[PDB]
Short mmCIF file of C-alpha atoms and ligand atoms in Angstrom, two decimals:
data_model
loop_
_atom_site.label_atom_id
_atom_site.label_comp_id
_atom_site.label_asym_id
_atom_site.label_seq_id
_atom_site.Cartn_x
_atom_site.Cartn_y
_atom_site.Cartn_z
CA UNK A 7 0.00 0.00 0.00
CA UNK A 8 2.92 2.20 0.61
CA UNK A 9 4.91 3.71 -2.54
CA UNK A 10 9.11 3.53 -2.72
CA UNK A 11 10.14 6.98 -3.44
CA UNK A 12 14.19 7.76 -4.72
CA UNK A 13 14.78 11.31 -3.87
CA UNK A 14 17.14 13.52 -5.58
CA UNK A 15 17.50 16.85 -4.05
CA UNK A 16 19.65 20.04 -5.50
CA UNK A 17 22.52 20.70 -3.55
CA UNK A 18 21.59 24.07 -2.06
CA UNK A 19 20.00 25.40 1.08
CA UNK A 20 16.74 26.81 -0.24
CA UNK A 21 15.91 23.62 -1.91
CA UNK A 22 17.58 21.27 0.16
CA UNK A 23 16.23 22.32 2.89
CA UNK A 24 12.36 21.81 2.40
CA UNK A 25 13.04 19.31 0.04
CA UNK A 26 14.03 16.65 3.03
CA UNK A 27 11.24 18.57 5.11
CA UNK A 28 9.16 16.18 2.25
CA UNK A 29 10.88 13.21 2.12
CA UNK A 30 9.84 13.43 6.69
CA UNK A 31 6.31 14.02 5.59
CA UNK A 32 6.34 11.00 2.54
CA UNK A 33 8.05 8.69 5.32
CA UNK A 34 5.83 9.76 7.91
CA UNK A 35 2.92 8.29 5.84
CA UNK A 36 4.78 5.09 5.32
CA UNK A 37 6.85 5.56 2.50
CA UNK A 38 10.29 4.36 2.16
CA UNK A 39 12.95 6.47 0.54
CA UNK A 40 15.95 6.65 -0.78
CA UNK A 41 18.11 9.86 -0.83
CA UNK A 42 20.65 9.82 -3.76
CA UNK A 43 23.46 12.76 -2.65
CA UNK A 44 27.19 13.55 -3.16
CA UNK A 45 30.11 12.89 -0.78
CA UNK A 46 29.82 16.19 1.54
CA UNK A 47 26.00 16.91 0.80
CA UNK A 48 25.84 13.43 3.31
CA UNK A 49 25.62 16.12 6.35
CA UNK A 50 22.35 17.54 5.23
CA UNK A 51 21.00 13.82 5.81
CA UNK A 52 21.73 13.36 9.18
CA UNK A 53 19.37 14.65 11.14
CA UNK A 54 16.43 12.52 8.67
CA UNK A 55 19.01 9.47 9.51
CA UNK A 56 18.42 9.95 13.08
CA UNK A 57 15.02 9.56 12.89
CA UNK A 58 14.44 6.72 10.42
CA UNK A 59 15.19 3.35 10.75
CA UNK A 60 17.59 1.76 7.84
CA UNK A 61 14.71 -0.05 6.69
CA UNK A 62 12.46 2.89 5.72
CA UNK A 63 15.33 5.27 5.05
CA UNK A 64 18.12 4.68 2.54
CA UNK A 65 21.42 6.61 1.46
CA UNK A 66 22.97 6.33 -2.53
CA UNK A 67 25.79 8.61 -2.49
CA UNK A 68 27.59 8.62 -5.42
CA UNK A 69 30.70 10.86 -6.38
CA UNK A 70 30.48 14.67 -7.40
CA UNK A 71 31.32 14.22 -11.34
CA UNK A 72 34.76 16.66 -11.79
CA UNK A 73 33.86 20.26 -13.53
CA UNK A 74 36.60 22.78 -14.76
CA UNK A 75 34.33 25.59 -13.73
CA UNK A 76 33.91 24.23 -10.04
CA UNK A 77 36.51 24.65 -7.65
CA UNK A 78 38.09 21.46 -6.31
CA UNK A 79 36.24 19.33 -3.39
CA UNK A 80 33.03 22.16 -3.81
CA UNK A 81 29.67 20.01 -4.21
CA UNK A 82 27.20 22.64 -3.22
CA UNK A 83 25.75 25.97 -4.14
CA UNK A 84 26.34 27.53 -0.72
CA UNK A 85 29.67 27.83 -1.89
CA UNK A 86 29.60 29.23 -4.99
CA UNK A 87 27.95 32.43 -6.26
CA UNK A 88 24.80 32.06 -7.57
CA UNK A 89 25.69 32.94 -11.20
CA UNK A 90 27.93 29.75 -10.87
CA UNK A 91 24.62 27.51 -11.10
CA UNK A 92 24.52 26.88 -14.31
CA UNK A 93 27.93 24.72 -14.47
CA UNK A 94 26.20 23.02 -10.82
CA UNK A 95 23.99 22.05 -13.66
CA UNK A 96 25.93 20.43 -16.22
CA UNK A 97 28.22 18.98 -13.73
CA UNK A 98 25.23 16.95 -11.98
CA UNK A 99 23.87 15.95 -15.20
CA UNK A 100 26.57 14.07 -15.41
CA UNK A 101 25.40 11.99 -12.43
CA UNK A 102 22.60 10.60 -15.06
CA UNK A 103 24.62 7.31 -15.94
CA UNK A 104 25.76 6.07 -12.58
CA UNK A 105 22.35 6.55 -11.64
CA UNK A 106 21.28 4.51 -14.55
CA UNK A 107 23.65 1.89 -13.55
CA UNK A 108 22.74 1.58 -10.18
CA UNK A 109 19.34 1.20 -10.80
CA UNK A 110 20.17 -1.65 -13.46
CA UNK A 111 21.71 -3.48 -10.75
CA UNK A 112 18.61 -4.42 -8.80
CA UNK A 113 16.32 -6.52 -8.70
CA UNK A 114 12.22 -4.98 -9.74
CA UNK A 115 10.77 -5.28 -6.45
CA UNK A 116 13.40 -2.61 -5.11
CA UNK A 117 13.09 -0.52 -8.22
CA UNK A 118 11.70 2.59 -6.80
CA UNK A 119 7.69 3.13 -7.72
CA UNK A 120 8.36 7.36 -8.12
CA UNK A 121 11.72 9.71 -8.30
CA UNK A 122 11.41 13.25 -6.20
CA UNK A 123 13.86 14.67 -7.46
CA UNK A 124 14.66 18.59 -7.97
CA UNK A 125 12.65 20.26 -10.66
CA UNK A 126 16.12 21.71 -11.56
CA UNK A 127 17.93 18.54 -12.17
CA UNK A 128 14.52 17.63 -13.93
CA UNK A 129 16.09 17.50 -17.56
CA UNK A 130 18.30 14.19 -17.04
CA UNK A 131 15.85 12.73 -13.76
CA UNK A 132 13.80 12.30 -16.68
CA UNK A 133 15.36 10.55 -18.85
CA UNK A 134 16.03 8.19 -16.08
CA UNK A 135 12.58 8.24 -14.98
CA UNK A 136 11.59 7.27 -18.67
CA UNK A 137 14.11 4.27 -18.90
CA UNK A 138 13.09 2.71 -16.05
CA UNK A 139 9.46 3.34 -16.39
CA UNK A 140 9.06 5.10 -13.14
CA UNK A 141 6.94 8.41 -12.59
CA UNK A 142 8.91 11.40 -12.02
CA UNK A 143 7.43 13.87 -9.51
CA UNK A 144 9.15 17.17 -9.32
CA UNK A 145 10.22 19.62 -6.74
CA UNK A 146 10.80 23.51 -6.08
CA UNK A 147 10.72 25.70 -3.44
CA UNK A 148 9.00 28.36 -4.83
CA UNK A 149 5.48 29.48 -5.26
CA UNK A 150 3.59 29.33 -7.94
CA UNK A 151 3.63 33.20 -8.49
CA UNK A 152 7.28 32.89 -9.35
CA UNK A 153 6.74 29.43 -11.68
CA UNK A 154 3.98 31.74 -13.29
CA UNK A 155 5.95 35.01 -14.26
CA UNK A 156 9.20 32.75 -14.73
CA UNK A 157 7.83 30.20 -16.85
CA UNK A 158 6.05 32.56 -19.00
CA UNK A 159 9.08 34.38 -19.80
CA UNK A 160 9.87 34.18 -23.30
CA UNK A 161 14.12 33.56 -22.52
CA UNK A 162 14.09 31.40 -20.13
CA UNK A 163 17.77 30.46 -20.47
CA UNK A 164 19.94 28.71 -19.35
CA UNK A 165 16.65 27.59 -17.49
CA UNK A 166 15.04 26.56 -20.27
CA UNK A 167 15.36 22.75 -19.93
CA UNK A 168 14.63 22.28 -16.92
CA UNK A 169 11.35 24.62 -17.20
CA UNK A 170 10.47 22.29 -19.99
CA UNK A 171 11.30 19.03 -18.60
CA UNK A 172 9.22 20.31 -15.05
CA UNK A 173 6.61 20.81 -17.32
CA UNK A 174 6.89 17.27 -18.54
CA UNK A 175 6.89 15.91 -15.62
CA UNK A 176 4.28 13.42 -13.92
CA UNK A 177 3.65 16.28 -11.41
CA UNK A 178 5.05 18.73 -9.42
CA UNK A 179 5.63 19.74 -6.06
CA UNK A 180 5.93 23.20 -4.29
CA UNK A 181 6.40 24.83 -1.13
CA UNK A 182 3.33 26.85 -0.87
CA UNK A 183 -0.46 26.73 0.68
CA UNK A 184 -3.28 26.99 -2.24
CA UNK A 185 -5.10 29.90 -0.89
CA UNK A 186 -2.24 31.95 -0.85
CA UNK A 187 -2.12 32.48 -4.29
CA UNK A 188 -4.99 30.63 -5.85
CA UNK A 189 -4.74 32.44 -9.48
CA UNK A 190 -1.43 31.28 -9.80
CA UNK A 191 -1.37 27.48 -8.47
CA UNK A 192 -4.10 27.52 -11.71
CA UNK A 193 -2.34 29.38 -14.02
CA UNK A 194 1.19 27.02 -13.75
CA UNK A 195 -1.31 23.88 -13.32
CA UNK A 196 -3.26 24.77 -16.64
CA UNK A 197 -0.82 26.87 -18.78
CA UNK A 198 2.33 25.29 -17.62
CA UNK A 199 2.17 21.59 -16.78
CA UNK A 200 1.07 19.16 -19.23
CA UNK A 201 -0.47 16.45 -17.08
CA UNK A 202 -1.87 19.76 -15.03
CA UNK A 203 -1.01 17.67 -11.46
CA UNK A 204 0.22 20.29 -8.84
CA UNK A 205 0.56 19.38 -5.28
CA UNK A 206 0.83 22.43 -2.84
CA UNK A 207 2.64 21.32 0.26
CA UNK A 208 3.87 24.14 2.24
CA UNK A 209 4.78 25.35 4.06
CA UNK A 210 7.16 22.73 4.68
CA UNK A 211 7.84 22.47 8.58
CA UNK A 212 11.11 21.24 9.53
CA UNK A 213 11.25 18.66 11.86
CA UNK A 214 13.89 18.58 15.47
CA UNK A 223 28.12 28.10 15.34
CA UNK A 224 29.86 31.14 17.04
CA UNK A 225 27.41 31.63 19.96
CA UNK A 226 25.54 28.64 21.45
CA UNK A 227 22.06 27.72 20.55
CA UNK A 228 21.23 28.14 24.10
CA UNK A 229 22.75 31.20 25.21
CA UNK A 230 20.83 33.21 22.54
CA UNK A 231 17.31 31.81 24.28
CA UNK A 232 18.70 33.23 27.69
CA UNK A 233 19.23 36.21 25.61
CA UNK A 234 16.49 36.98 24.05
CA UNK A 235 13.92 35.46 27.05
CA UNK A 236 15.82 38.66 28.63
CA UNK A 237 14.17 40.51 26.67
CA UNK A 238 10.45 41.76 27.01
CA UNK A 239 9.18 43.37 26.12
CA UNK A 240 7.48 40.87 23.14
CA UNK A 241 8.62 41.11 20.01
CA UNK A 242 11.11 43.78 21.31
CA UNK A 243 13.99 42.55 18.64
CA UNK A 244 14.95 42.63 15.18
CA UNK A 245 16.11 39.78 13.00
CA UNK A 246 18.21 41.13 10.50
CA UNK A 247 19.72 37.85 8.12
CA UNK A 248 20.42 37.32 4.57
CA UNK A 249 22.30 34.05 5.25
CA UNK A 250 23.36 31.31 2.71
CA UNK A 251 23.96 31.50 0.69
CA UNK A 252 23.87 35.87 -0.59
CA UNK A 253 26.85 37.68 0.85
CA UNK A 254 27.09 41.24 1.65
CA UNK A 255 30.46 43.70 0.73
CA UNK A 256 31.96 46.08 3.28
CA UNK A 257 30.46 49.36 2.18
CA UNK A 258 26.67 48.47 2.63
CA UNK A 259 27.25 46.79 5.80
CA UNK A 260 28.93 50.02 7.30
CA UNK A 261 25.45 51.35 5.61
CA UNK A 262 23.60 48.82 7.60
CA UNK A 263 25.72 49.05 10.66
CA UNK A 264 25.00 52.58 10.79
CA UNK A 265 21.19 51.90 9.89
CA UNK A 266 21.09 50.07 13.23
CA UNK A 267 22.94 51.52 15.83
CA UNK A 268 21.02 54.56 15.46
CA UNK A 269 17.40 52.82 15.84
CA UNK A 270 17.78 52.23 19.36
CA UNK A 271 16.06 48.59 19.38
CA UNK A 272 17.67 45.17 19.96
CA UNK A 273 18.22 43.58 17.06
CA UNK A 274 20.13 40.19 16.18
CA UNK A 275 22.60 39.52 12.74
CA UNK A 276 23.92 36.77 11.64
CA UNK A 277 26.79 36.74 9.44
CA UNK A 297 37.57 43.38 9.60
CA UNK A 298 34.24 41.42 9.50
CA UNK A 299 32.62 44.51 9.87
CA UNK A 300 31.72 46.51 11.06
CA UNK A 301 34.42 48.02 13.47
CA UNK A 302 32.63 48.50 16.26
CA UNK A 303 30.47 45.75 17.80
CA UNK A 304 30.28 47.43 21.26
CA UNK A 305 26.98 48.91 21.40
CA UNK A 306 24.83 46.28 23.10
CA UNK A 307 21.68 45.58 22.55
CA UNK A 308 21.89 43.57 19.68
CA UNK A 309 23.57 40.49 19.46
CA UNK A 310 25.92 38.81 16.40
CA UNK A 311 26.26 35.68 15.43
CA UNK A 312 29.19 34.62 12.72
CA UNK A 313 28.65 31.42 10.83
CA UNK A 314 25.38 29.17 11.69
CA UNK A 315 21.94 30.67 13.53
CA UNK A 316 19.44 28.74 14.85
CA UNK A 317 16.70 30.95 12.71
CA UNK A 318 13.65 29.10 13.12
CA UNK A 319 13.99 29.24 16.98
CA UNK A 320 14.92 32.84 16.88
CA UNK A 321 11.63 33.85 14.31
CA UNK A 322 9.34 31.51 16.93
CA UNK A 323 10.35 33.45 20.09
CA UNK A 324 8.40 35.59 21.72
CA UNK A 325 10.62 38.54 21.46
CA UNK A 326 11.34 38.52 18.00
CA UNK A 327 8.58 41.25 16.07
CA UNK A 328 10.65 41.93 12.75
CA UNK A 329 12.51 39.76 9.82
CA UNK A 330 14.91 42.06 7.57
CA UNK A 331 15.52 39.85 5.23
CA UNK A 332 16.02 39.36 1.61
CA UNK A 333 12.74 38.36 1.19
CA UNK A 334 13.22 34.43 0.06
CA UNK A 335 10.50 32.43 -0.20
CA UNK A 336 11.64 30.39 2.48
CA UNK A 337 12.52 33.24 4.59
CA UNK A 338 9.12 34.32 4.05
CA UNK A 339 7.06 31.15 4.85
CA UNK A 340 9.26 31.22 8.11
CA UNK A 341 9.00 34.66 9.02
CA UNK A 342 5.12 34.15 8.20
CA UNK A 343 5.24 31.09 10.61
CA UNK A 344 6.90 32.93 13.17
CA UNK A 345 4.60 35.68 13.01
CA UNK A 346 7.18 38.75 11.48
CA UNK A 347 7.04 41.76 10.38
CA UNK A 348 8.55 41.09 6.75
CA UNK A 349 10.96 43.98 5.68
CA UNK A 350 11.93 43.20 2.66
CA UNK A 351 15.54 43.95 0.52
CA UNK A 352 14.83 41.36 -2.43
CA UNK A 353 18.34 40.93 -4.20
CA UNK A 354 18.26 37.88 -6.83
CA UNK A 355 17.04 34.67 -7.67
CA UNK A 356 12.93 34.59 -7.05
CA UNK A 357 13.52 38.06 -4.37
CA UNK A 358 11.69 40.58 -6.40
CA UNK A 359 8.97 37.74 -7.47
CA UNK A 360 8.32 37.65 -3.74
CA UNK A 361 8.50 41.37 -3.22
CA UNK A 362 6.17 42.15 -5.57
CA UNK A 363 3.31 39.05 -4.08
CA UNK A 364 4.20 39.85 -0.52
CA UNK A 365 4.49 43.41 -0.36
CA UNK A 366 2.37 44.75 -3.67
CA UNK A 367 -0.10 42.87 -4.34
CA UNK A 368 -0.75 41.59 -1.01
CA UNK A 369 0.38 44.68 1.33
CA UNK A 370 1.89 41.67 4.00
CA UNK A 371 5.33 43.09 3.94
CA UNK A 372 7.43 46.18 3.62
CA UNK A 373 10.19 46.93 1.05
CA UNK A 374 13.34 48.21 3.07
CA UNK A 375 15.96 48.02 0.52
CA UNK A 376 15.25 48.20 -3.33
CA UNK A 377 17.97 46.70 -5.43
CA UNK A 378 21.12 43.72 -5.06
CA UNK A 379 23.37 46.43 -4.54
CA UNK A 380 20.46 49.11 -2.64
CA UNK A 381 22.22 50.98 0.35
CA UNK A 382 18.99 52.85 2.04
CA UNK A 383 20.34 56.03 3.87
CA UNK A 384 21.14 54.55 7.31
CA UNK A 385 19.69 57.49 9.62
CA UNK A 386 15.85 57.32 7.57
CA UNK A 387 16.19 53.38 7.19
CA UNK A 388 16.65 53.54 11.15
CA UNK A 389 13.57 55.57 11.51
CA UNK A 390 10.88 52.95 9.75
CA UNK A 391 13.14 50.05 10.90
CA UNK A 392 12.47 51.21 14.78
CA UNK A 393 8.32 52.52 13.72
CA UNK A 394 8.69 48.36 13.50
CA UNK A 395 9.07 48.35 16.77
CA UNK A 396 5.59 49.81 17.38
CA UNK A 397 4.93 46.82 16.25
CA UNK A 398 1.20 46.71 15.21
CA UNK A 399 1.73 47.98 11.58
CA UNK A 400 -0.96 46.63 9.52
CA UNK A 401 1.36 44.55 7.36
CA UNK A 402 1.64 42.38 10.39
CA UNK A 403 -2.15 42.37 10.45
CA UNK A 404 -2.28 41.40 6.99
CA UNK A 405 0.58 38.78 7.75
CA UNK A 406 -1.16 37.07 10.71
CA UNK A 407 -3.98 36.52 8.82
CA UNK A 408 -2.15 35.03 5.45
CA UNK A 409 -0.76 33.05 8.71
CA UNK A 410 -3.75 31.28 10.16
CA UNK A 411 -4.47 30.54 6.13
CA UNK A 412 -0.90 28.69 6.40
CA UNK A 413 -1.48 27.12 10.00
CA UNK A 414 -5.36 25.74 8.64
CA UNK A 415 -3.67 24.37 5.59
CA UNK A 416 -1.33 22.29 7.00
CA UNK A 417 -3.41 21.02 10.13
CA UNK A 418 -5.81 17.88 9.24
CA UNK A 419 -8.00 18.38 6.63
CA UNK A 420 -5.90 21.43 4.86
CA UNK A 421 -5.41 22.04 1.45
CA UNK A 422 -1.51 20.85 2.10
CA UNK A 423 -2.33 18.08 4.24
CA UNK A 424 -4.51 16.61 2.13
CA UNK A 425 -1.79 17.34 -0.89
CA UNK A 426 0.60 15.36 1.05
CA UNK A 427 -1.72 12.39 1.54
CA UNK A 428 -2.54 12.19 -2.40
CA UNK A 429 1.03 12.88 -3.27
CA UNK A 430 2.08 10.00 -1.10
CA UNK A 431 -1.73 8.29 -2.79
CA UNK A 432 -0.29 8.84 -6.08
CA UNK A 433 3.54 7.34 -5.93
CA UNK A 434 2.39 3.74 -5.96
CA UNK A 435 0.07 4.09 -9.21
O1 QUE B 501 14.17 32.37 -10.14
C1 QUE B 501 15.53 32.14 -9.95
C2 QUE B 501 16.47 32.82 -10.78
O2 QUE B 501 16.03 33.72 -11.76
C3 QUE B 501 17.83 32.53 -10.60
C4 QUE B 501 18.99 33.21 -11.27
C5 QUE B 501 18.96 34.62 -11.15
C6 QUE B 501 20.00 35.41 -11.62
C7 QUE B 501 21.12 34.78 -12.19
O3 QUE B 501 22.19 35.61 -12.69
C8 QUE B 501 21.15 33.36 -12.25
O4 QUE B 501 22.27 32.70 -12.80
C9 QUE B 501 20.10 32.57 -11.77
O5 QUE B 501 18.21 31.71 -9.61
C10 QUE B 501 17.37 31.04 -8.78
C11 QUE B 501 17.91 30.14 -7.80
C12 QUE B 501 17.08 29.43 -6.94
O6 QUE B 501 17.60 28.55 -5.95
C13 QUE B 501 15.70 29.64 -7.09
C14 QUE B 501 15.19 30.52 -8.05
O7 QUE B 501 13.81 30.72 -8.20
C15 QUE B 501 16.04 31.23 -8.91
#
């Protein structure tokens, strides 16, 4: 009754990330994977390790083919600019025979019944899919307001193929709630997929370097009031350069409010103190979740978003690349849930006005949080029992053993 699933995610954060928060929720119904990786993506796997047994939860690492354009021993996109994707690309494609081979190799009653794998590694998961006559579901992190305005773009390329072979597909998979954007979940599901099967799962839960996870809760419980704090993080994988930090810096010393940042370094002086900084890993979700957090600044990712929207944030958004302005222009235009703090990839706002609105954040009962809280209990009642995502997750799960 229970499908065999082989899951291929992209070796970055932002789809990495939620795209194990779905192979917990296809195991959780009773599936049994098996997560096909490269030598130091193994890591991302270990947590999903810990909590499934070797019999429902299997690992196929196979070696990172060798690329000119990638630096030695670098088998991720964290590392790597983001222009640098497209060799990421052909260098996994690569990965296509080995797979093959492997899957040659055993016997049809382990052969998987579906392949999850990344809607941008789509173009060869295919052709393996095909070969081996196995359905090939596929999977992005991004809503369907992005797929819509990206897919409809007349150059697509370099994503061209893998828009293409997505919309070839079996199915796919995203990281949203349906009545979050309704009119666009329809638009990719008519005008963009050919077998028009969509499954909106979001937003993807997930399941449980330089200051402790627990010393920042003793922090910030020492703080009330609530939502006292800022949360200002652009993490992995966009990095910042020296003059707009001093920018930023500036922005927040002169707002008064505790904030938190997680990245000389820069800037020079750390020593005003009410506001904390973190180099290397933060424990985000925990930080969003806390009572004392009120405000996100972020770069306004989609995954930023659904987690700021989880942990009940204002949104200020500085949208920079990839699916940013997408975002900015659902979250904070059309739907008046966010504010836009920064405009461009290389914005600096003038630090002593951005300091003013930043703090009026503080207040913190802007109706953009209002407008938030409510797109929030939408997310909350979609992925509780009987929820448009819940019930997407128990038909996608449904639909792997046909
Ligand atoms: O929508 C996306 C997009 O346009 C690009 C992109 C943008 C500018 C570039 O110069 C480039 O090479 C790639 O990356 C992405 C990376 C993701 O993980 C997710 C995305 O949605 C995008």
């Amino acid at each position: 009754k229970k499908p065999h699933v082989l899951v291929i995610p992209f070796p970055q954060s932002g789809h990495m990330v939620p795209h194990l928060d779905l192979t917990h929720q296809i195991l959780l119904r009773g599936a049994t994977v098996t997560v096909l990786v490269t030598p130091k993506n193994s890591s991302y796997l270990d947590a999903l390790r810990s909590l499934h047994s070797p019999e429902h939860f299997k690992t196929l690492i196979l070696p990172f083919p060798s690329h000119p354009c990638i630096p030695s021993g670098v088998e991720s996109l964290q590392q790597l600019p983001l222009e640098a994707i497209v060799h990421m690309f052909d260098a996994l494609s690569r990965l296509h025979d080995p797979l093959v081979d492997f899957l040659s190799r055993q016997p049809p009653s382990d052969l998987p019944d579906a392949i999850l794998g990344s809607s941008f590694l789509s173009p060869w998961i295919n052709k393996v899919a095909d070969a081996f006559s196995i359905k090939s579901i596929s999977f992005l992190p991004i809503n369907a307001h992005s797929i819509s305005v990206m897919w409809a773009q007349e150059d697509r390329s370099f994503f061209n193929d893998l828009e293409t072979a997505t919309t070839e597909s079996y199915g796919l998979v995203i990281n949203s709630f349906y009545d979050l954007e309704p009119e666009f979940v329809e638009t990719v599901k008519t005008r963009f997929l050919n077998h028009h099967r969509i499954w909106t799962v979001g937003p993807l839960l997930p399941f449980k370097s330089s200051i402790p996870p627990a010393k920042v809760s003793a922090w910030l419980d020492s703080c009330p009031e609530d939502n006292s704090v800022v949360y200002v993080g652009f993490g992995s994988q966009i990095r910042l350069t020296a003059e707009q930090t001093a920018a930023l810096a500036a922005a927040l010393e002169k707002s008064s409010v505790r904030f938190i940042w997680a990245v000389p370094a820069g800037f020079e002086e750390r020593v005003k103190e009410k506001g904390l900084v973190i180099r290397g890993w933060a424990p985000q979700t925990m930080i969003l979740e806390h009572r004392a957090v009120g405000s996100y600044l972020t770069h306004l990712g989609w995954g930023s978003v659904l987690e700021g929207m989880v942990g009940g944030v204002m949104l200020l958004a500085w949208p920079m690349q990839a699916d940013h302005f997408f975002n900015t222009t659902l979250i904070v235009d059309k739907l008046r849930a966010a504010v836009r703090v920064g405009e461009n990839r290389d914005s600096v706002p003038d630090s002593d006005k951005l300091a003013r609105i930043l703090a009026e954040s503080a207040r913190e009962d802007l109706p953009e949080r209002v407008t938030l809280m409510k797109l929030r209990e939408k997310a909350m009642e979609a992925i509780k029992e009987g929820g448009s995502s819940y019930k997407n997750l128990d038909e996608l799960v449904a639909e792997m053993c046909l």
